[PDB]
Amino acid sequence: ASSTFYIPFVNEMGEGSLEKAIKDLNGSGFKNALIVSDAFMNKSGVVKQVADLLKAQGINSAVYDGVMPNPTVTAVLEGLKILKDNNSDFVISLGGGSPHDCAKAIALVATNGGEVKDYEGIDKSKKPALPLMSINTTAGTASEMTRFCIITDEVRHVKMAIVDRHVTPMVSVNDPLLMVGMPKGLTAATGMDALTHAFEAYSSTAATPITDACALKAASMIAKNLKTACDNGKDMPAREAMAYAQFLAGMAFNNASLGYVHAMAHQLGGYYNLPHGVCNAVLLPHVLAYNASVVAGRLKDVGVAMGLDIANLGDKEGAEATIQAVRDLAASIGIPANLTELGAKKEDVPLLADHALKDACALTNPRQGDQKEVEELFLSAF
Amino acid sequence: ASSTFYIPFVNEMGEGSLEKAIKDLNGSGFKNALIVSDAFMNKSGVVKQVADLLKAQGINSAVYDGVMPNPTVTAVLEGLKILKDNNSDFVISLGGGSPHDCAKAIALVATNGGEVKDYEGIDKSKKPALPLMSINTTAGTASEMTRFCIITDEVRHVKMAIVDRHVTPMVSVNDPLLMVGMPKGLTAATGMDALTHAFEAYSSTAATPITDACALKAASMIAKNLKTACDNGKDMPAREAMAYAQFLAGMAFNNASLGYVHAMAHQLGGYYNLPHGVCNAVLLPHVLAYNASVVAGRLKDVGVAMGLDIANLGDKEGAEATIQAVRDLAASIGIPANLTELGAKKEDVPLLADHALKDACALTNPRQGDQKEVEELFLSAF
Ligand SMILES: [Fe+2]
Ligand SMILES: [Fe+2]
Known part of the structure; x- marks a missing residue:
């Protein structure tokens, strides 16, 4: 049976891959990044770290740390609100699987306009998601490189799987330096x-x-x-x-x-x-x-x-x-x-x-x- | 350890992947494809085969079968002109290594500059190349998936190397049906x-x-x-x-x-x-x-x-x-x-x-x- 292999076209790995991935944004045209992350990632200071590296490159950023395990539609909607009010033109997930999933949904809706639910299924989105960079901090999920996006409907109490090549991050980042802190x-x-x-x-x-x-x-x-x-x-x-x-x-x-x-x-x-x-x-x-x-x-x-x-x-x-x-x-x-x-x-x-x-x-x-x-x-x- | 893994976002493989790949183009917005290949690929009918599958999906196409073994700059210029006269909105390479590198250059210069030399080196291009799909017909080169682009300019008798994440094809195709004919x-x-x-x-x-x-x-x-x-x-x-x-x-x-x-x-x-x-x-x-x-x-x-x-x-x-x-x-x-x-x-x-x-x-x-x-x-x- 024929097959298809999906993966980001650029995947940065190893100690220092973070600095490298951020520096490559120079001349990309991005000016406002929406950083989607965990409250734990923002407290430890990882969020600031990324925000600062971005700064040194002349790129501003807005942060949405309201992501909790098992990303929900509400969380996605909140991130979309921050994106709107900041006119974010780029999205960066920071943390484990939850942040990556939430970011993918935010990025997809930002360009496709509608509701998370509309994209449940296989390749439902008509246009590419807003550019997305996924910085992974746990060593097991790989959501920073999959074309999967699973968001939970809190009201209906249902998990929706979005299987779409459009949610594949443009760039993945796996810097073990950010994984050292994992308890x-x-x-x-x-x-x-x-x-x-x-x-x-x-x-x-x-x-x-x-x-x-x-x-x-x-x-x-x-x-x-x-x-x-x-x-x-x-x-x-x-x-x-x-x-x-x-x-x-x-x-x-x-x-x-x-x-x-x-x-x-x-x-x-x-x-x-x-x-x-x-x-x-x-x-x-x-x-x-x-x-x-x-x-x-x-x-x-x-x-x-x-x-x-x-x-x-x-x-x-x-x-x-x-x-x-x-x-x-x-x-x-x-x-x-x-x-x-x-x-x-x-x-x-x-x-x-x-x-x-x-x-x-x-x-x-x-x-x-x-x-x-x-x-x-x-x-x-x- | 400070590494980067490059590869196309989508890679179709196996018997019938060619048809699956072209079929996915329906509703893509592309209207005029530029098919880059050898002279023997066009004669043997493989080009027509692709052009027809494209028509079924509402996509017209023009062909450039001037690619010689070991791509040349004159070739890139020839294909580039054909793209101009047909106002092509995406490129398709068909064959082994030669057609792929030629197409990569054509697609890159089509949206960035005017001369191939301008991109010799690493990540020289400032903008993504015109969308490119590479259909591989030999089993050993992998040019359909590399971020490498080598073009020989007869003048200085030098083979310029374009190492750019932007020449990585958007979609790679490896259908063994098109390989059966390899002597x-x-x-x-x-x-x-x-x-x-x-x-x-x-x-x-x-x-x-x-x-x-x-x-x-x-x-x-x-x-x-x-x-x-x-x-x-x-x-x-x-x-x-x-x-x-x-x-x-x-x-x-x-x-x-x-x-x-x-x-x-x-x-x-x-x-x-x-x-x-x-x-x-x-x-x-x-x-x-x-x-x-x-x-x-x-x-x-x-x-x-x-x-x-x-x-x-x-x-x-x-x-x-x-x-x-x-x-x-x-x-x-x-x-x-x-x-x-x-x-x-x-x-x-x-x-x-x-x-x-x-x-x-x-x-x-x-x-x-x-x-x-x-x-x-x-x-x-x-
Ligand atoms: Fe899992
Ligand atoms: Fe080789």
């Missing part, structure tokens, strides 16, 4: 989110030789660095490795798509308002076991990439040994042991599974189940 | 060129975890499919694999750069007027032996990727086995035995070695040598 908990969660992207992309029915290569490289680098990055966030080599790893994982899932881990995790997070990262982290092992009955061999490929001594094992054993390795890694970095700790409730599963099967990510899972299998899958995670 | 010699030469890209990019001092991942995957796929595509150009799986492989090789060298193989090959190709791919092919094994003194370990990684049973060998021994594997491959697909057969004269070595060291690709070769060492390298290649 151990965040490092572990976003790291597992990235590992999840690798696993799901490699297991996807839309996998291609390119996504395969990226996903495996991501898994390998994660197995080699995540634990290190968690034990000591000052280890620059580890931070940089995780930055390339999460990007490679995005190169894979942005194009092969995901599976049941995210189909489900999107529900737990968007219902209990839990962190995207940790939800996938706790669900991963259980979904892999569920899929092992269909992609045992490929799961073994990932384990080998991860350095596991399973090359001489049959696929079943190799797969089970891989899953066990994921469980061990998760424990070693303190991921919560189950959905019970996450604060999930068995009474909500019937609805969680119901929405899970309707999530855009479910279509590519290797093993397709019914409203009753997904419910039982969920229950097995508590 | 044996061409698939072998372009195939070996892609292998060289993987080897040089993996050996490059500018390599990153991303380019490494793409390079190894490219070498792996080529090792498993090149011979088959040469023995049976009708085998779609083989052609499909080579399309993906040559793209991956591009994802790698466009970002990590190359080495002494191309530095040297570019001299033979110019100071003898020989095909790019074949010069690289014959040279490759020799340069690898030379670089082995510094990157033995990495050469072994490529050999393992290529499916060689050398995992239990030392790096020095693995590299030699990999180098021998390259020699065996080249021979099995009809690549000349040495420079003597290419029509090169030993008395030209001093001159060839001097310009090789002056080549831009020389800077990233893992082993740096002087005039003497290079002259010797060349001679040992006879």
